Design a protein around this ligand. Sequence first.
Ligand SMILES: CC(=O)N[C@H]1[C@H]([C@H](O)[C@H](O)CO)O[C@@](O[C@H]2[C@@H](O)[C@@H](CO)O[C@@H](O[C@H]3[C@H](O)[C@@H](O)[C@H](O)O[C@@H]3CO)[C@@H]2O)(C(=O)O)C[C@@H]1O
Lengths: 124, 292
Amino acid sequence: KCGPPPPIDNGDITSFPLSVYAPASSVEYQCQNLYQLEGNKRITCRNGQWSEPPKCLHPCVISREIMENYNIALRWTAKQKLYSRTGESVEFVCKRGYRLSSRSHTLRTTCWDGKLEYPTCAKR
Amino acid sequence: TPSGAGEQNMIGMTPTVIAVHYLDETEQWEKFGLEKRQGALELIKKGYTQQLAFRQPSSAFAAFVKRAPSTWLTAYVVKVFSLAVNLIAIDSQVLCGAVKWLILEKQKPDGVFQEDAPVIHQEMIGGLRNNNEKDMALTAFVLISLQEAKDICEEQVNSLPGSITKAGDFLEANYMNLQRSYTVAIAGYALAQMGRLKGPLLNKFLTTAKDKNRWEDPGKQLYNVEATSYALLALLQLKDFDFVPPVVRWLNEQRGYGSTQATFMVFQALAQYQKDAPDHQELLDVSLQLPS
Ligand SMILES: CC(=O)N[C@H]1[C@H]([C@H](O)[C@H](O)CO)O[C@@](O[C@H]2[C@@H](O)[C@@H](CO)O[C@@H](O[C@H]3[C@H](O)[C@@H](O)[C@H](O)O[C@@H]3CO)[C@@H]2O)(C(=O)O)C[C@@H]1O
């Protein structure tokens, strides 16, 4: 018999908590909107003990602040801000007349766990 | 009677819940007619029970069974049900399920709450019906509702305190850019509640008032009543009893269609003013809100 399930950052269980859980019994987690479950969504009451719980991978937030800098702006839409899931790509072109000064590929990237590497475009 | 009852029922619940609250909090039942309390409690029960038929499998609410649920309405339900927890039996799964849906489904990574299915009856949302600063205004509105539920649900819903914190960060990071008195008042209450209103933000909050007695913007005056009520709640959180008497007088002097928010917020703020403030001024009439 286990106690209440552990918490995880940016997520919670998909059911209402109880005080004591009979062994064999499981519960699932879910992450907040745009966060990505890493690991098994389910845990089990293993001899009076919870099995291991998942991680929630961070999305990447593309601000009007970040835009004004690396001198890149939004390629398709014209939203002054945008959110990207982990495992999902964003695409820019350069600012008011600049060249691609980063790597031989980098305009198209993979947000992963809050990390997204921006292409830099330098002036003139 | 307009048709989308998931919303209309909340409009009709509102006068009764906030009247009872006001009279409980100020302990003025003796004067009003203590005989009438039991009846008011049953009217609240009947509002609550009727709202349950609009609760979706997701634990969110909407005007109809097959309309997408509203973020704003689901948060207004949480706030109203939270004021009623020691008035009637409110099932925690109903209240904390709605809280968890907000947190899990409608909050964006940077803390913002978003509305994907606006309410049909836009007159019920008071000064939110404005389109500038809606991210801040709505995030504040929802967070205030989360704050009301924190102690009922913190246990049933572990993600609640972090979602609270994350909403506060977003308000704090954008408070200084705000232009409208309404947002300054509503976000200022939300921040003050968490003790996170200070420095330039506190100064900005206080200096936004007109004549040190109201928070107002060009527009429907009902929105300024509602703004100033939040502001009065923020001042009570701050324990700033020096700033308070002119605010209370201006509000008391301002005694319909589209008045759900004004009514809710004036009665809340004035109840807390009398509950908290030493030698408070004599105050208005509750039988309008609570007839027989
Ligand atoms: C986080 C996020 O929103 N990711 C999307 C992105 C972004 O919306 C966008 O990149 C930001 O500017 O869009 C993605 O889809 C696009 C992609 O398939 C590209 C391929 O180069 O094509 C785009 O459709 C274009 C179409 O190819 C053009 O010929 C046409 O002129 O316009 C269309 C739309 O404007 C896709 O939108 C992306 O990968 O960049 C998908 C991400 O998940």
